[PDB]
Amino acid sequence: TIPNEGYCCETLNDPIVDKMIGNAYYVVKFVALRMPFIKNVSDNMTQLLAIHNKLTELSAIYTKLDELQLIH
Amino acid sequence: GQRGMPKGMLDALNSRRYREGEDYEYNPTQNPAQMIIEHKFPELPQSALTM
Amino acid sequence: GQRGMPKGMLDALNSRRYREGEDYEYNPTQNPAQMIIEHKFPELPQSALTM
Amino acid sequence: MYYIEELFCRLANGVLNNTGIVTDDRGDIEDDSKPFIIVAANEALTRLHGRFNMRNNNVVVEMQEGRTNYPLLAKYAVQSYDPNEVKCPFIMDLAGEKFAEDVIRILEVYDDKGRRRPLNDRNNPCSLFTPRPNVLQNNAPKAWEVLNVMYQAKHPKLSTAEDGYNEIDIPDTLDPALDAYIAYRYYTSLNTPESSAKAAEYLSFYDSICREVVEYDLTSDTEVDTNTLFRKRGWR
Amino acid sequence: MYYIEELFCRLANGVLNNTGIVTDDRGDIEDDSKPFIIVAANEALTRLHGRFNMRNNNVVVEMQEGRTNYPLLAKYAVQSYDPNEVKCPFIMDLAGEKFAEDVIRILEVYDDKGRRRPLNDRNNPCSLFTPRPNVLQNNAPKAWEVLNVMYQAKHPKLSTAEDGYNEIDIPDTLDPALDAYIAYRYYTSLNTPESSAKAAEYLSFYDSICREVVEYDLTSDTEVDTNTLFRKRGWR
Amino acid sequence: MYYIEELFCRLANGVLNNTGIVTDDRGDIEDDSKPFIIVAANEALTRLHGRFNMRNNNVVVEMQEGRTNYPLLAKYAVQSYDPNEVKCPFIMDLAGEKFAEDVIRILEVYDDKGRRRPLNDRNNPCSLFTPRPNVLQNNAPKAWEVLNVMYQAKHPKLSTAEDGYNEIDIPDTLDPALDAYIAYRYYTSLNTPESSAKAAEYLSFYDSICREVVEYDLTSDTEVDTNTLFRKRGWR
Amino acid sequence: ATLQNQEAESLTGVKAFAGGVTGESYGDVAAGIRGVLDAASKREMAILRRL
Amino acid sequence: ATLQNQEAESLTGVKAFAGGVTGESYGDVAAGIRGVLDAASKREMAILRRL
Amino acid sequence: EWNDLMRIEGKAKPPKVKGRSQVQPKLVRRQAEWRYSALTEPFLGSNKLFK
Numbered sequence A: 001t002i003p004n005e006g007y008c009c010e011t012l013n014d015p016i017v018d019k020m021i022g023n024a025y026y027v028v029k030f031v032a033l034r035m036p037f038i039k040n041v042s043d044n045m046t047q048l049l050a051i052h053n054k055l056t057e058l059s060a061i062y063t064k065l066d067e068l069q070l071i072h
Numbered sequence B, C: 001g002q003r004g005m006p007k008g009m010l011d012a013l014n015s016r017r018y019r020e021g022e023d024y025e026y027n028p029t030q031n032p033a034q035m036i037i038e039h040k041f042p043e044l045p046q047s048a049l050t051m
Numbered sequence D, E, F: 001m002y003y004i005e006e007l008f009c010r011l012a013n014g015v016l017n018n019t020g021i022v023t024d025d026r027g028d029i030e031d032d033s034k035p036f037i038i039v040a041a042n043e044a045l046t047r048l049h050g051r052f053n054m055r056n057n058n059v060v061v062e063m064q065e066g067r068t069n070y071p072l073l074a075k076y077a078v079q080s081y082d083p084n085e086v087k088c089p090f091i092m093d094l095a096g097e098k099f100a101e102d103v104i105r106i107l108e109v110y111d112d113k114g115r116r117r118p119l120n121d122r123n124n125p126c127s128l129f130t131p132r133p134n135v136l137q138n139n140a141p142k143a144w145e146v147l148n149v150m151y152q153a154k155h156p157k158l159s160t161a162e163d164g165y166n167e168i169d170i171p172d173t174l175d176p177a178l179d180a181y182i183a184y185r186y187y188t189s190l191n192t193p194e195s196s197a198k199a200a201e202y203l204s205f206y207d208s209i210c211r212e213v214v215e216y217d218l219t220s221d222t223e224v225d226t227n228t229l230f231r232k233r234g235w236r
Numbered sequence G, H: 001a002t003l004q005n006q007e008a009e010s011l012t013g014v015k016a017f018a019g020g021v022t023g024e025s026y027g028d029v030a031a032g033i034r035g036v037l038d039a040a041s042k043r044e045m046a047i048l049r050r051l
Numbered sequence I: 001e002w003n004d005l006m007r008i009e010g011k012a013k014p015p016k017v018k019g020r021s022q023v024q025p026k027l028v029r030r031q032a033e034w035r036y037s038a039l040t041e042p043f044l045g046s047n048k049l050f051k
Helices: A024-033 A035-043 A045-053 A055-062 A065-071 B012-019 B046-050 C012-019 C046-050 D004-012 D031-051 D172-189 D193-216 E004-012 E031-051 E172-188 E193-216 F004-012 F031-051 F172-188 F193-216 G002-012 G030-050 H002-012 H030-050 I027-043
Strands: B003-006 C024-026 D056-062 D069-071 D103-111 D129-132 D135-137 D146-153 E056-062 E069-071 E103-111 E129-132 E135-137 E146-153 F056-062 F069-071 F103-111 F129-132 F135-137 F146-153
Touching: A024 A035, A035 A045, A045 A055, A055 A065, B012 D103, C012 C024, C012 F103, D004 D031, D004 D172, D031 D172, D031 E172, D031 E193, D056 F129, D129 E056, D172 D193, D172 F031, D193 E193, D193 F031, D193 F193, E004 E031, E004 E172, E031 E172, E172 E193, F004 F031, F004 F172, F031 F172, F172 F193, G002 I027, G030 H030, G030 I027, H002 I027, H030 I027
Parallel strands: B003 C024
Antiparallel strands: D056 D146, D069 D135, D103 D146, D129 D135, E056 E146, E069 E135, E103 E146, E129 E135, F056 F146, F069 F135, F103 F146, F129 F135
16 A cells, blocks of 8 residues: 655664675664674673583473473 | 875865865965966977987 | 976975876966977078078 | 864873873863863864864765755754654664764765665755755655765764763874864953964864874875776767 | 853863953853854854855745735745734744744745746746845746745854854864954954954965865865756757 | 973073073973973974974884774874773784884885885775775784885974973974974963064064974975886886 | 768768758869769769669 | 777778768869778678679 | 667667757768678679679
8 A cells, every 4th residue: 555664763773684695784674773783692602602501301201291290 | 197286275065076076165374276286297308309 | 209397486385286197386486488498490490501 | 983082182282282281190181170271172173174184974864755845953863862752763774873964075975786876966856955064955865765975074062061072083193283273262361462373373274284184194185096087978 | 953051162272262252261151241142153154154065945835915025024925923913924934943044045946736946047938036135026826826936055144142043054174263263353353453464364264164175176166967968059 | 302301491491481481490380280291392392393294203003803994093003002901902012113103104115025005096096095094994904914114294293291292303403493383382371462572572482493394404304216108118 | 960961961861962052062173074074974874773 | 089980990891981071071182082982892792703 | 789889779879968969970881881882782793693
């Protein structure tokens, strides 16, 4: 019907990327607007490495979640 | 083929337009007619041809 | 073939560009037209040919 | 670069060494007389950045639907806009690099797609216009059109407040010119005829320094580029 | 872009620091002499806007039958008009700032149809005329004809009264010229030979600053455009 | 090549012998006024290094990704930098004297590959730019690109403080010019008509000495080289 | 103005008699008159063959 | 402008009749007219042999 | 490429710039015109083509 696009409006860190990959300014503005999401992961990278180090450790226990409830 | 332009005859904006081939405005204190030197081949002396 | 350039007509940066064949800017107090002497062969006197 | 306090010391142990507005130890200007120097200092910096194209800064402007005039004011910046009266800012800057309205003269404008946009071309329909020196006007705002404006910029305004700027970034060869203009303003304020003669000497000295810099081109003001019209004209 | 209050503080801590027109702390001007500065300030701004084409503004005029002269006065605008005096205003400023009555010279006139109406063309039957600089004359008002007038606009009049205009919008490079002109009027009004000599210096300084701006073209006063007569004359 | 101590002794037994700024034995300057001479001395040395291309120095800059502007400041050098503030300095002065932040004008730039990078060429895609006189801008930082910058360098700043620079390195023929300029600032600061006339003479003497040096070319300022365009143009 | 007429005549090979109807435009030497007329006549003769 | 036409005629050996169709460009002396026409005719004659 | 020089259609076409002329003299075409009639005429000078 009528156009509805733009940067000031209809744009937020929550929505997903659009088709306008070719625009260099768009992707740079995309990451810059979502800076706190990157910062939250970055400063807590130590915790993620420890969890990822035992990624398969938590997968095996996931296979018997209901069975462990029987003991409790 | 080298161009020599006196300093202060053109402002920053007008100098670029002249270099880009567009119309420009100049300070009246300096006439571009005697300025904007366009070096060319010096005239050969007649003595060399005679010799 | 020797080139003579008056001192102070060109700054340090502009002098190099002129020597490299690029466009340059000069102090308006000295017109390069009467400067930048390009020595050539002097004209032979007519008396020598007549004699 | 140096703090404004060093400027106060340099003036105290410089042109203003024999004035009544300096401290007893000649270490600093009188506190109540400090705003007088600050006003003169900002005025002197504006003149230097006008004659000499020393600072070239660029800003990013986002086109908004239904808006044609885009003033380059800090109240429209993302870091300084008031949401009460501004629906959304269109001037984008950073927290540590807030826009300071230092625009003097617009030089060139490029869009987000890399095409040069002509300015003040009345016969070109797609050209942009500047009804005011610090106001940019676009006659056809598109959907995702973003414009970058590169302009000659003045030095940020100094302020004695802690949050304000307290540093000077100018070529050190122009420091005598800065001191001369400040001295000229101070001595001109005094209406005694003896001070009037002294004031003119500093102003003449300030002008002499500026022309000396131009004569030797110490700030790389002169600019040249390779010829491109030769190919465009088809000389081959 | 600063309010009128900063101008008084800048003058008090600036050129007018030595004179007695300022307060004891040199922070403001006396209330008994504030209108004196306002009169000078209004005069100074008019001179700057005359020499330089800094501001360009446009207005919308709706033709009314039976009326051939359309003065560009504030009382004929849709805003700030008396409904009892004028029944239907013909100047529309429904959005943005109100019409400030700042007309100096008419540049061009375009109608609602999108064409250009010739101005002051005596040999053109359909050309408009200006019997007075601020009065626009139409010799054939139509039913739905609407005219847009582009003109060089001066700064709106400043006033310290309530609900007046108290904001200054000039390029920052012209600030020294404003201070010099105001100081020139103040010192020349004392009728003192010592002050008269000082007044002459400020006037010369004001002229020196203005010619410096023109020399370096800091206001982008010049304007060029792509030649269109080449195709019009059929050179091909 | 002499230390700062000899300068005070030379001035005390030189041009400033008659004034009261020297000790009773005319052997040194008063400690209360030593910084006054230092400010003048720094100003005088900058002027000489601007008119004459006496000193040429080069620096090594290592490109870092994500950074396009590379200011030539002391805090970004591998020496005399704060590891807490800047994580990796990009100016290398591992050997010889430390970087003294004495950049005036950039002359030429050569990369590690051995080629010459064009400077301030607007039409050249791979040319560098200088938005500020002491700031170098690269628009495409590579992985291992390293740039060498040759520039006209002024004398390092002198300071009487501990661990400062206290050595003067200028050609001995310019010593009278240094003394004349320092004396000019001292006498002109007294605001005395008798001293003002004396101050003007010293300034003229300083200019007279400098033009004498240019006339006889004692600094070898001029530079010529074998013509290479003859083969480049194919004259053969 | 005269350049356009000269260029137009060169292409079509037709004596337009620009600047008045006269034989002065043909040349001076009679030997050169034979060459120009014969060369132009061939183009005229070629069109006659088609007709 | 005239140098390019002169150079082009020298290479192809074809009288382009630049600057208007006229025999004035052939020369003045009839003796020289025979030499230039005969020399140019050989190049024209050579192409005829192939045809 | 050779056909693009006989007529101004290909790379030889001048760039289109607003406010400036876009004409292009046909130097190559002019040379070809004086060759067509010169070579075609001998073959059509007689009723019989082959002897």
